[PDB]
Amino acid sequence: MVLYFIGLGLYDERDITVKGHEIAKKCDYVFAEFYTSLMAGTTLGRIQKLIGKEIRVLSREDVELNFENIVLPLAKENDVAFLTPGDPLVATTHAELRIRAKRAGVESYVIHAPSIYSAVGITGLHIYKFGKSATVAYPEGNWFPTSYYDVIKENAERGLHTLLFLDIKAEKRMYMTANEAMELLLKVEDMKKGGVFTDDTLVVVLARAGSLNPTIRAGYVKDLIREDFGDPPHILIVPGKLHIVEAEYLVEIAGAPREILRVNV
Amino acid sequence: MVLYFIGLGLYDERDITVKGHEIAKKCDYVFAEFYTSLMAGTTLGRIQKLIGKEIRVLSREDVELNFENIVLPLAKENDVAFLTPGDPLVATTHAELRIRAKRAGVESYVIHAPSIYSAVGITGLHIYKFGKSATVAYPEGNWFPTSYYDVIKENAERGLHTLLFLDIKAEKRMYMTANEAMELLLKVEDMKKGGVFTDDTLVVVLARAGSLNPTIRAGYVKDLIREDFGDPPHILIVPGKLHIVEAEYLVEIAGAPREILRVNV
Numbered sequence A, B: 001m002v003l004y005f006i007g008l009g010l011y012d013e014r015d016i017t018v019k020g021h022e023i024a025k026k027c028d029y030v031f032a033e034f035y036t037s038l039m040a041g042t043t044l045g046r047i048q049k050l051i052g053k054e055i056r057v058l059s060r061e062d063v064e065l066n067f068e069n070i071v072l073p074l075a076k077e078n079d080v081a082f083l084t085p086g087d088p089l090v091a092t093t094h095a096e097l098r099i100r101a102k103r104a105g106v107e108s109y110v111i112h113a114p115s116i117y118s119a120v121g122i123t124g125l126h127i128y129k130f131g132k133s134a135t136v137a138y139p140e141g142n143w144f145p146t147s148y149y150d151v152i153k154e155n156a157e158r159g160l161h162t163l164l165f166l167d168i169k170a171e172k173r174m175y176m177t178a179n180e181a182m183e184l185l186l187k188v189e190d191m192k193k194g195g196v197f198t199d200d201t202l203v204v205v206l207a208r209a210g211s212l213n214p215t216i217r218a219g220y221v222k223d224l225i226r227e228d229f230g231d232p233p234h235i236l237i238v239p240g241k242l243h244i245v246e247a248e249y250l251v252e253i254a255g256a257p258r259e260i261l262r263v264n265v
């Protein structure tokens, strides 16, 4: 009678850890949500087949409003698993769900899995150099979010890299592309004119991290804003001041313009 | 003709992903390094048994100086795997190893695994709020490094959390405890007197992330500086101002004092 928060990883069903696999296999009931992120290389059936269990998929409302009515009750009798893409407690509000479990007298355990937060290392940018992170959100009616623009500015002034998660509207099967994120950022620049994100800004796009052949591209906005980076999900990164080895990697591995090799220390 | 950079995960032999396990199992040669970190919850023998392959351990010099002479030659006519604790490419100098592979006409692929960079999410602290990261190094001889202190200052100053890696002597299997890290910081505070780290500073300690029973403790330095967090490795986090939900989690899950619900929010 316990609850397991189990991460499924970045791209397909094999991104789950062996630990999560073996534990998930032995749970009595298995729940999951697929709205916090997109696992582009697998399907529910493949995940179900891998753990040999039928998976009840929950919506954001089920989780956020009814977690303790749908999931917790069964944990007070059986071993329950709650699966999520990536790492269960990263860039989500899932940690709070552990507080709910505790208050219901249910013990919970966390099984981590690869997360985009660390997978950014494949871009060649030193992970310790990443500053505050943010999310580029889709404008809604008259509401046009812009906070993420200030995050980039703050990090950039400190010479730190900025990780930008991209919006997702799972119910409409909408996944923001790096292209759309760049368009939105240029518009915010026009509005704020802080010289933070322009046609000459160097950016890095990582698409489908976790797959064997993710798309890793670096370059100036003017050249990438209309480039095809393949299917979602995508994440956008605005590097801060680069170390020489970072620039070298971006050029040799991400096909960046050879001119960025010339860092202005 | 292929080199696989494969992450071993956080704590034990089951922390590798299903993808990493299956791929490594099929490789003709399997290399590993345990100088950037150790897998405290397992042994080389247990990792070898799970992978079903004998593993050749490489020292720091073997990798940084002779990667192209030890690993790459074999990857030209065989499938070779290179295992590292955590997520591959997280360690600062590892990304450059892919450039070496390209230079030798070797294709390389990255198989991710959980990293402490994302696993710290189990502390209840929002991942987007983490700023620049740093490592606490022991002073020695006429050298007393203090940069990690400036990192805390710059982060907290902007309401950001600071992830602190603690000094490790992998070869000698010697670890810096969170207790020791706190003492150094207090000693650095006495010299710089910037009001950054004191007896009243709230900190979070994470030990054995990845195991099913990690140690997660939060509290003021005056109360935790002599507490026993168990066996290494320990990770120290100096949070910035907390969101009320972060504080509630630290109180309910990490045993933090109720006091933080009003003092650090």
Ligand SMILES: Nc1ncnc2c1ncn2[C@@H]1O[C@H](CSCC[C@H](N)C(=O)O)[C@@H](O)[C@H]1O
Pocket: A010, A011, A036, A037, A038, A085, A086, A087, A088, A089, A090, A091, A092, A114, A115, A116, A117, A164, A165, A166, A167, A168, A206, A207, A208, A209, A210, A233, A234, A235, B118
């Ligand atoms: N495999 C992947 N490749 C690129 N971006 C990814 C990704 N997985 C997640 N993301 C990014 O992160 C957003 C989800 S945020 C939730 C992240 C998740 N808990 C984790 O640990 O990864 C997506 O909209 C996307 O922008």
Ligand code: NA
Pocket: A127, A128, A130, A131, B117, B130, B131, B132, B133
């Ligand atoms: Na970070």
